[PDB]
Amino acid sequence: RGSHMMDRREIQRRAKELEPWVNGFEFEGIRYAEGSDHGYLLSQDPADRARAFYEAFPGATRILELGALEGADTLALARQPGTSILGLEGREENLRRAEFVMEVHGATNVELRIADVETLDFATLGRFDAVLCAGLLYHVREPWALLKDAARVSAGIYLSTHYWGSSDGLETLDGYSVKHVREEHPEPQARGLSVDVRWLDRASLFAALENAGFVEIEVLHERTSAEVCDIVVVGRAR
Template identity: 35%
Template sequence: MNKEILEEAERLRASLDKPTAGGLSFSNAQQPLVPSDPISVEFHRLGPWFTQFSFKGKEYGGTNRYAGDARVCDFFEWLDVEGSLVELASFEAGHTLMLAENPAIHSILGVDGRSYLIERARFIKDLYGDKKMSFELCDFETEPLRRLGRFDVAFCSGLLYHLTEPWNFLREVATITDRFFLSTHYAVEELESKGEYRGETRPEYGYYEPCSGLKDHSFWLSLRSIWLALRNAGFEITHQRDLPDAQNGPIVNIYCRRSGKVSG
């Protein structure tokens, strides 16, 4: 990451007197720099990281581990297809590494809206030598997903609640796949209406805050509105796990298939 991005990220992070990422709170502690270890040096050059990685018995990156992650466990349990996968919001490739371990997944395209996260993800790909993975930049607020091509399944975790118009994003997902795993926070109270969808507006902190949306606000859909938006996009829910007591707010994990019926 270049010096300007590092300085802006630190400035923004220091200026916040409340949790980042739409009201969510995460640890930003880093693994210590070991100057004699070139891998450690490269991690620190690309950081600060959120995700903790284990490589050849050493720990690198941040302090947040994905081992035993319930989202990936649910996805593997419910997965009913083999082939190509697109990961919508690949972040630092923590989930990507886990997804690549499943032999049913033949290839993974990880997509994210921040160039510095794509750089980190490509570093992880090269570090682990995983040939299944590739990464591409995409602004989910402005760019159509269909330009990415078609995939056998899509995996989307930690993105929907960072978007200003999540219902439009779900319609875009329906143009690239017939199988879709979604893990997202949702609004408990339906404080506002956006057309037929209800939920609440949350603050976001832009490009330089990696655990946030790209705009200055997002719209958290209520659970009922998530169901409606999926149905309007032509998806039929086949599996769901509601986690109302999850850290940082309620989460729902959903696996769905295209029904072919699009509303609106």
């Protein structure tokens, strides 16, 4: 066992101490921890997401990831030589798992930081070639503001989000049509940091992207229903 490797005993001990995991943890063919009942609602193919991300942003060498959870997408993005990733995560318990993942895998081109995207001054972060914003936009109170924050630091966003499939009866805030609800996402460790969230209807999601500066929007995937809809878009700004 190479001197750079964490002992399997320590991998096991720390993985167990870090339970409960959301997406589980396996290394060297050993399943140390299982994920949650609703982990299926989150990224389960980080390698495929990273491929799609780098198809969209082939030149990217400095990437910002928002809502890094247990570091699965962070690690997949970091496999590339010549890239550096900053992953922001709002829940300390999740961040500790992501930090463990990076240590086990020796992923030295990753930095992870605790941060609340609703209050962070994004102008302190520097510039990024692109922002990964997956599974997060429906966990904040003012989603349009998170998109503006991405545009403050980058000209590219890979956005995976839900939106609400109807406009009738929605509230209005900053001119956007919003479904304002208590934060009750089925996965407790995926929840936002406010008591409430606002979902957008489709028109308001696209307006919010445009108003942030992401004026070219490519739809990679969309699933529509009357209520919860899913979309993956690449937004590009001037």
